[PDB]
């Protein structure tokens, strides 16, 4: 099996350094294997050293990376990835073409607090973050608590899925779970997202105990010198 | 306050509506606000939307050069009467910029 | 008819005035003064920082109107910075707190 | 409520969590009448990080904002091979997150 | 209300009406755990007076007022043979229909 | 040497009860050394010198170096249905802009009612 | 939305034409009391016939042309107002079609 | 108003002395939970013995001395608080006499 | 915002340090009466020394370190409160800095 993963917008956006990876697995172990990259016009590009170590279960696990201009990717030039093995004399050729960009649209971010019935159990609370209506599918989402980022393993993110009501539109979910005590200590959580359409490329929404469907509306309206001198 | 332009139909068959086009705003709607509650229900808007009833008889053409946008509605019936509004922003109410009235002498 | 004394957008206060004619006479022409504040109950204390607690107290010194702020402005953009650890690279990135108004 | 300000559509989400094993079934209906199956989408059972082998799922439904405001209730039903009746229902409507009470305190003065 | 000003017990009733034919099945469960059939009673299908060719039943559950003031959703499941999937249920809690309450405190001066 | 403070006052409430005329007073105080004169313009058109009557600079009751002056003007009672605002002005060397136009109108003055209409909402964040 | 503006004569009978929708069981011909913003159902699939109209009205449903017809026998001055017909558990929330009635005598 | 300040020992039994009034049929020995301003009936003439006190308490009334005596058999730390006794349907609006209990072990 | 919390002794004199701002001509050392929400000007550049403080206070301005110093000669129990200093024609709108005073005797 030969797996190719193209670079993500967020990688190119944040890390800036961009690369594309082809990896091989489920293959008998055999040294002296060559990894190459080919464009549509046949030009070859430099492949990087530091190939990944083989997996402990007696199968391949390799990394191959190369740098191609972001403007070249935006030009929609088809690129091909090839690997050579003696088992299969015919090298495996796979395409990592970037299809430019379809009509761009901003992702509406709605963040919702835990349900009232769930808090009745006083066990744990789950906060969701529903991104909606972004074209194309390239949204990087993350969670932090009171200015401190959380582990990637404390939340789960979905994958873009079609939108029945809107043709050519995608949406995604994300949920975070924490104890009830943490939710009941005014701790604040936020759901930052990253997309090409976003003018700042990054936007965020935030909720806490007091803002998520509160039970009471404590207000202290106070005005003075109503007469005053107005001109 | 902003103008209260009024238009009529002179028997059904076609109608044309024009409203000013604001700058630095991406959303444009023509909600009818013909509800007892008053809450305006967006009829035809950008950002992808349309009215369950108003379909195939409603289209929008924005012209930045003239600072205007154009909406063309084919035919005419009894339901699509009363008044209409225009606006921008992300709040159908509180974001209006005109109050147009639609009537037909048929 | 009504003149406008205050049009503050930070406090959404519209102080205006009007004099109403009496019953066909130039006497007892009572003057008026209309004040209309619209309080936001969802906005934070530090409007440009989405971590401060909610805004409970609202103090209105009418003299100043005719700096802590209460509401946003439809004609302006609000931005901030957040740490993105993508690729194990903690990175402070600008974020459009109030999008659709930064275009 | 932010989505409602657009006066276009509304999205009710049904969240099923904690079950084991997989293969749960979710359907949408109102006032006892089943709803068309082309208006909602359901996710496949997804592993739960902390849980050793429990899974979760979520489904969403889109309705007109007007319909939500009219006052109609929408019930969500799940069918799993572990529930004693193998069926369960929940219910939400406009009267769910209304503020229970106000505590305003005007202190108008001239000095 | 007057039942609760006793501090001993409360009764919750589950009226079922307008079904046909008989042999409806009602049972009471708390937060997913079915309760013992001795804790509640049930009526028998008896005809609806104004509505011909119909029946209705009843069921009550006794419960301490100590725990009713704390939660305990207390759903009432019904199993007829004409439902879309043969089972339905409803629930009520201490805060089922509490309305909005205003506490204006003008200090007009 | 201090900024010449200036003020203006409207006609008296009981004065508007004989239906003959009305007087508007522009009070000029300070201006040390005493160098001021007032010209009463309306709509940018100076009025006749025979209407406003400036008198003299006079020392303040407690006068280390300060002074003050008073100047009034006579109008017609029936003309106050429209106001016209009857602007006043002062001039002094100890002023960065050497002009402090001061004007009042029937509308300006004491409010006879305060129609406050405050509203509470959870969607005012933008304050469209 | 649509108004039949049905007309009739004192005595005899008059037929009210209303659309028969699908995925909606309860079908009613509510009378718009328009007093305190409340509409009282005259007839429904729940066999709810108002006392004032008992033995004088009937409701027959047949999905041939997606129409259900309701007949009112006899006629009185009282029978001269609005009878919005609709579906749904809450009567006031439905009442899709509106109609008017009068008397010619 | 009056406080017996009754005292006892762990195990055994202790007798609570409370006044037996007339023109009041329901007689109870409520326990002042003092949690959310609520009092839970431990025993009553209507026959209700709390589950935690089931089979351990009894109430005997005799018009000999306008006194009714309530005995608590066994004893636990839990049995060390206030047990206001009173009459009438409303339990929180009675509590004619207040008493305190403890444990000596 | 800042508080000098200046301290002194009965008799003698004490110097109040307050910031001297620019684009503001009237500079005052108002005393926070805190009675009906009103502050009375003790001294000003417009030349107004309260009668109770007449002949005992002075105000000298020199934009060397952007500071104006006010000296209070003598001292009385009355001189033991808050003296917010500020600028601008309005007095109860300035109060740029707040300070407290007391007596040690
Ligand atoms: C409200 O938030 C703003 C933004 O964080 C605070 O001002 C910022 O302070 C940091 C240093 O703490 C600077 O790096 C930023 O440049 C400041 N922002 C601007 C726009 O200059 C501000 O202090 C906060 N207010 C309160 C009362 O805490
Ligand atoms: C409600 O407001 C009052 C002051 O008006 C304050 O004492 C109290 O702490 C507030 N409630 C909460 C929960 O903060
Ligand atoms: C309700 O308002 C009063 C008056 O301001 C205040 O004392 C009290 O603390 C408030 N309660 C809550 C829960 O905020
Ligand atoms: C209701 O108002 C009164 C008077 O201000 C106050 O004492 C009380 O705490 C308020 N209750 C709540 C729940 O805020
Ligand atoms: C008082 O205020 C309300 C709300 O703005 C307004 O409708 C009304 O006309 C005002 N009354 C007067 C006399 O100005």
Numbering used by the authors:
A (entry chain A): 346 to 576
B (entry chain I): 19 to 124
C (entry chain J): 3 to 68, 98 to 134
D (entry chain B): 461 to 571
E (entry chain C): 461 to 569
F (entry chain L): 449 to 576
G (entry chain R), H (entry chain O), I (entry chain S): 20 to 124
Provide the authors' own sentences about this structure as they appear in the paper.
FcμR is the IgM antibody isotype-specific Fc receptor involved in the survival and activation of B cells. In this study, we image a complex of the ectodomain of human FcμR and the IgM-Fc pentameric core using single-particle cryogenic electron microscopy (cryo-EM). The analysis reveals multiple binding sites for the N-terminal Ig domain of FcμR on the Cμ4 domain dimers within the IgM constant region and provides a framework for understanding FcμR’s role in immunoglobulin recognition and signalling. A key common feature of the FcμR binding sites is that only the Cμ4 domains are involved in the interactions.
We resolved only the Ig domain of FcμR with the remaining ectodomain density appearing disordered at locations distal to the IgM binding site. Fig. 1a-b demonstrates the overall architecture of the multivalent engagement of the IgM pentamer by FcμR molecules. Each FcμR is similarly positioned relative to the IgM subunit. An IgM pentamer has ten potential FcμR binding sites, but only eight are found to be occupied.The two FcμR-absent positions are the front of subunit Fcμ5 (position 5f) and the back of subunit Fcμ1 (position 1b) though extremely low occupancy at position 5f may be suggested by features near the noise level in unsharpened cryo-EM maps. The tip of the hairpin-1 region in the J chain may prevent the addition of an FcμR at position 5f by marginally blocking FcμR at Ser55-Thr57. Position 1b seems available for binding, but access to this site may be blocked by the hairpin-2 region in the J chain, a highly flexible loop containing 30 residues that remains unstructured in the cryo-EM map. The eight binding sites on IgM pentamer are not equally occupied by FcμR. The highest FcμR occupancies are at positions 1f and 3f (nearly 90%), followed by 2b-4b and 4f (40-60%), and with 2f and 5b the lowest (around 10%). The low occupancy at position 2f, which is sandwiched between the two most heavily occupied FcμR binding sites, may indicate a subtle steric hindrance between adjacent FcμR molecules. Multivalent engagement of IgM facilitates the capture of soluble IgM or IgM immune complexes by FcμR anchored on cell surfaces, leading to FcμR clustering and signalling.
